Write a protein that binds this ligand. Structure first.
Ligand SMILES: Cc1cc2nc3c(=O)[nH]c(=O)nc-3n(C[C@H](O)[C@H](O)[C@H](O)COP(=O)(O)OP(=O)(O)OC[C@H]3O[C@@H](n4cnc5c(N)ncnc54)[C@H](O)[C@@H]3O)c2cc1C
Ligand SMILES: Cc1cc2nc3c(=O)[nH]c(=O)nc-3n(C[C@H](O)[C@H](O)[C@H](O)COP(=O)(O)OP(=O)(O)OC[C@H]3O[C@@H](n4cnc5c(N)ncnc54)[C@H](O)[C@@H]3O)c2cc1C
Ligand SMILES: COc1cccc2c(C)cc(=O)[nH]c12
Ligand SMILES: COc1cccc2c(C)cc(=O)[nH]c12
Ligand SMILES: [Zn+2]
Ligand SMILES: [Zn+2]
Lengths: 230, 230
């Protein structure tokens, strides 16, 4: 409906399976009348390193540099690098944030890890206190749309990779829940490089079709039990 | 003696607590007669992004860029960027790789994420297929030395952060095990910033003491059961 979506997208190749998933999301959400923004990290050459270049003002302690202290202070003073504050404005206005990425080492590619490290700073995304259900991005929805090398069978409790939910923990809970997001169920598109033409088409359309009803979903309970069972 | 250690270190500040932990590791291993090499990622301005610049000369398929494929072929045809192959030589020669970093979003800082993404390429670290135990770095030891913001109590199974072992899974299992490493128990230095001066000394001194008999240690069983089970 009347909602803003930010898609944070992390793939080098527009003709990729990730690129297709990002474009069907843009096409489907735009069809519904949503306001849609994409941060295409590699095309923006997004800086992933957390450095002292991310602060442009007088440092709180120029003798011993502490990235988290300095960026928290910079956020309050408005002295963060503008690439960071550009992304913060997108996130502040968004009702839903979708992350579209290939799994790299059971996690996000580094360029996207750098977006989380630098954009989700203290004062903007959380405060101490003001995290988990009290995070500063409360009200907002987030969803991981992930592609894998490994097959769905590999990513089971007794498969070699363990259950797919296990590698979701640091991203869903440690990052998105910590910032206050409600987490929608992940979209995992398994092993598209191995899959047939028709399985690949089906995976694209399953995503497109789920997006038709995304505003009707409830978030997951983003708890240890959900991720690990027991 | 004779062992080679590589320390891959990811902190911006030489006077940091991470910096102190890296420096006692160098002091202690050097005292024992070990060959020691440090990759100081921030001081190297190490590139974290996985891009086509990682291949020199010409591409295996310059119409559709697939990073895994292109870097696999580059590795085989000795055509990877020299920042990558410089790291790979350090890893190839090392008996033990220590990673020293502050926890960022239940994981490694993006600069060290990019080291894993770009250094541990197919053909070097693992083959498809050719992993976990068919994994090309077998024989090597790896150890995560992590500092946290949250206290040990926060990091228990019913604490807000969940168990420490839960965030360890993508690094120890999805990355280090997958590559063939035997994984030594993690060194976790919980919450240095909230001091005291004496307890901080204590944590530096336990790390130094542990490194005294590091070569006597048995690896962990790097299993779903160790990370999640009872
Ligand atoms: C550094 C690194 C670390 C990795 N770590 C892991 C890991 O820990 N665990 C794991 O499982 N995997 C891992 N992988 C594998 C990685 O997750 C997969 O290679 C990636 O998820 C595949 O997605 P893709 O977009 O690149 O696929 P592509 O190679 O782009 O897609 C496969 C095929 O789909 C085709 N296609 C594109 N669009 C469409 C469409 N509209 N309809 C039909 N077909 C289409 C493409 O043309 C291509 O033929 C790793 C890879 C790298 C490089
Ligand atoms: C982007 C980001 C994401 C984060 N995500 C998480 C997360 O997911 N989970 C989490 O728990 N935390 C997280 N943190 C917090 C982070 O892990 C801690 O801030 C960090 O681990 C502190 O380690 P440090 O080396 O920077 O401590 P420092 O601030 O460098 O130092 C601690 C104290 O020890 C002093 N010191 C240095 N050397 C010695 C010495 N030899 N003896 C005694 N004292 C010494 C220092 O001067 C300082 O006073 C995050 C931080 C950031 C910026
Ligand atoms: C290309 O596929 C891959 C590349 C790198 C790592 C993995 C892991 C850790 C599991 C998996 O199933 N596939 C992988
Ligand atoms: C400054 O401390 C922190 C910064 C950013 C994230 C965390 C998380 C996820 C848990 C925690 O205990 N502390 C954190
Ligand atoms: Zn959660
Ligand atoms: Zn394992």
């Amino acid at each position: 409906a009347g909602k803003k979506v930010l898609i944070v997208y992390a793939h080098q190749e527009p003709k990729s399976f990730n690129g297709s998933l990002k474009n069907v999301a843009v096409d489907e959400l735009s069809r519904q009348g949503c306001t849609v923004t994409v941060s295409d990290l590699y095309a923006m050459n997004f800086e992933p390193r957390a450095t002292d270049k991310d602060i442009t003002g007088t440092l709180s302690n120029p003798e011993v540099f502490n990235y988290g202290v300095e960026t928290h202070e910079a956020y309050k003073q408005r002295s963060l690098a503008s690439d960071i504050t550009d992304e913060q404005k997108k996130v502040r206005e968004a009702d839903l944030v979708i992350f579209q990425f290939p799994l790299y080492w059971f996690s996000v590619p580094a360029i996207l890890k750098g977006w989380m490290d630098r954009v989700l700073c203290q004062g903007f995304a959380f405060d101490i206190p003001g995290f988990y259900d009290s995070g500063l991005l409360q009200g907002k929805l987030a969803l991981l749309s992930v592609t894998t090398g490994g097959t769905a069978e590999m990513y089971t409790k007794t498969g070699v990779n363990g259950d797919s939910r296990y590698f979701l923990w640091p991203l869903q809970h440690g990052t998105l829940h910590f910032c206050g997001f409600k987490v929608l169920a992940p979209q995992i598109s398994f092993a598209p490089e191995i899959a047939s033409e028709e399985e690949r088409k089906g995976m694209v359309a399953a995503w497109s079709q789920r997006l038709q009803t995304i505003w009707k979903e409830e978030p997951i309970p983003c708890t240890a039990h959900w991720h690990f069972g027991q």
